[PDB]
Design a protein around this ligand. Sequence first.
Ligand SMILES: [Hg+2]
Ligand SMILES: [Hg+2]
Ligand SMILES: [Hg+2]
Ligand SMILES: [Hg+2]
Ligand SMILES: [Hg+2]
Ligand SMILES: [Hg+2]
Ligand SMILES: [Hg+2]
Ligand SMILES: [Hg+2]
Ligand SMILES: [Hg+2]
Ligand SMILES: [Hg+2]
Length: 667
Amino acid sequence: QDKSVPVWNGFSLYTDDTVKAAAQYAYDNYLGKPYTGSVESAPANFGGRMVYRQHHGLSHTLRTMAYAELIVEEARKAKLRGETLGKFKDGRTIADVTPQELKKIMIAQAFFVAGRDDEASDAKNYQKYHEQSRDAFLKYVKDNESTLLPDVFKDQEDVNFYARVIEDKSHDWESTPAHVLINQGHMVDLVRVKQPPESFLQRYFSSMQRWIGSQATEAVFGIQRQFFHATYEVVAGFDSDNKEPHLVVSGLGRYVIGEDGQPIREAPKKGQKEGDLKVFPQTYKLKENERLMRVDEFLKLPEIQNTFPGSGKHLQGGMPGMNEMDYWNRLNSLNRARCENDVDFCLKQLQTAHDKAKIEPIKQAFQSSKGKERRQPNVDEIAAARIIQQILANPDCIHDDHVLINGQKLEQQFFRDLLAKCEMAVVGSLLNDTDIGNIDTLMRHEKDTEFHSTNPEAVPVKIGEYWINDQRINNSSGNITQKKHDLIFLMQNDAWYFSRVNAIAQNRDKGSTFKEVLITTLMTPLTSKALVDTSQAKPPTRLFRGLNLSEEFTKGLIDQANAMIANTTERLFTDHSLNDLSKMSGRTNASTTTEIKLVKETWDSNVIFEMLDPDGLLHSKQVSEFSVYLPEDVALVPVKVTLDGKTQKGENRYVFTFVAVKSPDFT
Ligand SMILES: [Hg+2]
Ligand SMILES: [Hg+2]
Ligand SMILES: [Hg+2]
Ligand SMILES: [Hg+2]
Ligand SMILES: [Hg+2]
Ligand SMILES: [Hg+2]
Ligand SMILES: [Hg+2]
Ligand SMILES: [Hg+2]
Ligand SMILES: [Hg+2]
Ligand SMILES: [Hg+2]
């Protein structure tokens, strides 16, 4: 076996302009148009906007194209792990598809159902609609020969073949990657809707598995679920205990259980311990003591259980961590209609989901370290936060020497008690932005309240006026993050304020009025909250580092990246359990930048490390340029390798993309 795979050239559905434009034309000219036929063709309304083709529309189409990218990706990975994939007649496998091929396929995919006039499913209409699809495709190419011509499709003959795949006449069927990726991506999109779902899933699975193997096939179906979430469509449950009749998908038939209580089988061919399961039509009349095989019975058959990882499993439907009511609303949202009518938006959703799906399995592969633990607020602190919020919101409760709020008279000592005994950072974490906004409320009411420095000769200041004027001029839009900033500023800079506040907060003040005590009690937790909510300084999410490597050495590192990438797959039913690369990517260093142009145009680096830091695990420091430290327990795990053109001299330029991950297991 040869586990070689050629290096990808950067091609993707999400970033190629030709493909995008092909989908856009498919939308504008076909998929976004009302159906003109009568079969099950009513437009559907999602959050108030119409989706004219909710089954075979834009989102469906784009999903089929994302599936092609995902299938080829998981096939390549399977070949790299050393598995033996199904072969076409020419000896190729799906792991051998090139970017130039996949791009022709995606463009063809864009028009695969453009030709449908409604949802009629009989064969005379299938054929007409696929002829109409073919014409659409061929019109597209004619109108764009110039750019598509030599550059995407070799010649008309090449164009004519993809046109034939779309037309899908049986006498044109071949085992080719185009034929198979197109039919497969198309049919797997039905998992979202068809019932019983266990029946359809096992069929579609077993049909993919023969091309790409079982572990890849789990990845493709696992990720598909995320694509459905991303495009605001239903994610189906999977129950291995489902009691309804099994549906024999091809032929829409059934299996029958006889009087013995056993499935009826065809006489056994030789070297078969048991005969083939006899497929009956739905018009077959059941005898007495005869019934249909249930889904659960089916999945428990040794021949299915031997071969399908979903036997004995369960997948909850919908979305992990949402209500039914929210989930239902999410499916019925404007976001569904946007996906269905806006190419850019829908591609972006799938993109984001596809990128996340490469990182998430890399995270599940290691014990994440236990984040810090935190005491709950005690009842006093919750009560302190309540009463501050109420005072802020109802400042007319504030009088010269006390607050009167819930039948009680709150005097000076009460607020000093809050400061002495509640932990004000904790109090401050119970407070919210509406509370920050009510600083204005308080300050308006207290406009001429005098706030006195600890300096006896200082002029008393009118804090409310101070606050309020300053906010009208410099934060007139009422912007709340900015109020946080301004409140910190006041605490840091104006000693007439901070001196009295700190003196009271430390119980060593002298000649403090009641209002000063009160105001100190209110502002201190708010200021705490402000520091905290504005000091969340985020490390950049995406960095680039430039290197200058012999192409030989580079190939070394490719083989190692391929080997880590190939071993991490999204699962569906089954589980999970230091290189030249890990040393090289990991060493602390200074030729880093957030600007890709720096790395390419200016430095002309022939090898680029792209570092993704979604979780901000990388200690970095600016020397555009930058220097990066890897915490001991943080590792850069490869996610992707590709050829990204050439340098100015003409040498191949490679990009290795890594993701920063935190684990005890590293150190
Ligand atoms: Hg429908
Ligand atoms: Hg179909
Ligand atoms: Hg279940
Ligand atoms: Hg089960
Ligand atoms: Hg008042
Ligand atoms: Hg009151
Ligand atoms: Hg009052
Ligand atoms: Hg307290
Ligand atoms: Hg004074
Ligand atoms: Hg600030």
